[PDB]
Design a protein around this nucleic acid. Sequence first.
DNA 1: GCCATCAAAGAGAGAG
DNA 2: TCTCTCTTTGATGGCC
Lengths: 201, 199, 199, 199
Amino acid sequence: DDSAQSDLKEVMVLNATESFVYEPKEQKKMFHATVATENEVFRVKVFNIDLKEKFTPKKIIAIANYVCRNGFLEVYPFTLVADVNADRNMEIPKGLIRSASVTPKINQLCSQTKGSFVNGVFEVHKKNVRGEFTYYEIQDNTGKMEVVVHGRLTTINCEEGDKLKLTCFELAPKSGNTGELRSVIHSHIKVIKTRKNAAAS
Amino acid sequence: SAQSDLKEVMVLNATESFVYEPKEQKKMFHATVATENEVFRVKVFNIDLKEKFTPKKIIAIANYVCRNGFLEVYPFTLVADVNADRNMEIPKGLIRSASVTPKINQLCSQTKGSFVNGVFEVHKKNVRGEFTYYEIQDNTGKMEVVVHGRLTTINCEEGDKLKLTCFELAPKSGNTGELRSVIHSHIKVIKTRKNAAAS
Amino acid sequence: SAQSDLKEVMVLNATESFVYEPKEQKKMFHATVATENEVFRVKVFNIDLKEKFTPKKIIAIANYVCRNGFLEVYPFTLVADVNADRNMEIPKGLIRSASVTPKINQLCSQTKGSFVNGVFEVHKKNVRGEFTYYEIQDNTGKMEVVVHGRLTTINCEEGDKLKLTCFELAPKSGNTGELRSVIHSHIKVIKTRKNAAAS
Amino acid sequence: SAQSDLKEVMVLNATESFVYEPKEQKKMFHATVATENEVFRVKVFNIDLKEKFTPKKIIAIANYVCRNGFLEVYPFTLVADVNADRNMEIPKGLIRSASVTPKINQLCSQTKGSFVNGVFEVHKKNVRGEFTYYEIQDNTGKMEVVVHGRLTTINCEEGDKLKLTCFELAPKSGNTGELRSVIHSHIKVIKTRKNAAAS
DNA sequence: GCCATCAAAGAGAGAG
DNA sequence: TCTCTCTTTGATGGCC
């Protein structure tokens, strides 16, 4: 947000979610994407759902008239997204393409004293369903933590022993040197079910 | 001289479940656990307890058997998941000490026969009949591993390393002491640069 | 009727050296090699060649014995390094076709004897005397694997995977074939994590 | 285009002071400092500041010069201790990738020059006149490092590791790029097993 | 000398 | 089948 260059960017698209409704009442539909300049990696909120094709991964597009909010670039119907020519042939550093796809370790997120927004895959250890807020205890080799789900995201199917592919969840300061992750407006969850839990054909 | 009282311990490490007795098919795995004040070696004879012995899991252990400096866990032994509130803090210095490999000139000089665990460099190896002789060494000196039975069929070579478990130290006259594979013995072989299959 | 004329190849994969004959301490390793046209199964009886057998390496092999679909590489065999001049490119579909496990319903319906490199799941292991029978399974059906000798000593339990090299599929009445361990047979057993060692 | 505004940083590492220009006996040291959100290569030309540069210390810097990716600290530059109040948390990920040595596949193939730090093992060393060249290698490839001037007199043999600070990468036509000695170059030689002194 | 974290590769799950 | 992601393996820096 604050001091946001906002200047036009040249970026290849990395990975993207399918279109979905994050706001049930109005049926507001968005999708998430991560793109990168040769220099730096950005997370992307796309509120014009006609841009999915533009965002097909391995595709280089031009982006301008976008909003900077919460460390994200926000793309609207008025936002310019267009195909960049074959002249560039931009080569994006492997180290970054990996870091944008890396999942933050739990003990890091716990020890974290600052708020932020997280993507990553997480193993669900305990699932505690309470009213409109479902808690998923997630685990790794370095420790375990809590994920609170509310809003539309409560309706999904994730069982203890499944994995959550998290996209845009807030980390908030919580006493005890352990932080809690919260389901927010634009949050999206892809569930990875182990083969025993999934349907069979 | 033992305890046998119920203990809340956290599992450090557990081997795989293996057959130490091929005649009857009898199976076991070895584990290591800790309380605040010390570290225990565990021979677990109920291998359905494998899950429970997942490292970084705290459990209660009761009705086990202390034998030869081991706790032995049988199917009549109580092993159960501990109260989630615990959050025990286990001293680090003691983990190393439980995880430390004895020096050879220190072992070969042993007065009283013990059961050893440790990892070592294998220099010479000699096969005679139903026995296999490993000449092992480090900066302090050198000694021998004497393997027999099921283990003789294992693949380990010069420059390979033996990760050894419950091997009986049998002191000999004139610092000739040697390690021998006993009934509950287990080995992981950690190979050198390329000892193994690739791709 | 085997050509035996010198081939220049690239190394795809190779097993570690192992003792396939305990009595003599006879050792060998396996390797899959490739030209641009065809994939070859190598047996290597000189294990000091293991360095020339690094995967990705281009090499020439001459004066090797062709027996049973395999190229047998002995101490007198010619194995040397291939320079940058070659720069040979091997077809993806073929390099891939070499690493594919034949489906189980295929091997049964096969009325011909042959040799197989495959990975499978262990359905039911019934240990009987000095023999071990692993039922295996995939999407397309089920069958048996029959082990004997040194390979019975292996630790593979129901729920593990079997990496097999040089196993003989034999014609068997009932439109299902079996894989009988042979002398040069090799197995890498792949354990699920919950059964695997931990720390 | 570097900040030039005051920096609150913590000292990570530094070198000893050395004479980089023996004619006037000009002296300097290298240091690496880091803030919350990034790392900087520093050049310190008032050697009396070595005290201030203790690792694990927090200092403020301003009125420095940013040249060639380095912060240049002169006698006129402001260097002073940091308030006991600061308490800054520096990410391990940012430090670890400052202290990461480049792979040689990355360096030889660059079109443009920069100033490099790293640890490399020496393979071949051959000497001519005022010039000395070191072929270094890692898993990704191999290349040369050309040292003329004061750094020729260092003791480095084949097999030693070279720790370089501020050597210039000079790309050449067809992946021929190399690391050259400049006026601010520094080296520590990390000697290997049987090379160095004893008792 | 052991363990922390971390980058590159065989192999599994999805799709066209 | 072939592509993509991934669980898995080998390195490398830090503490006793």
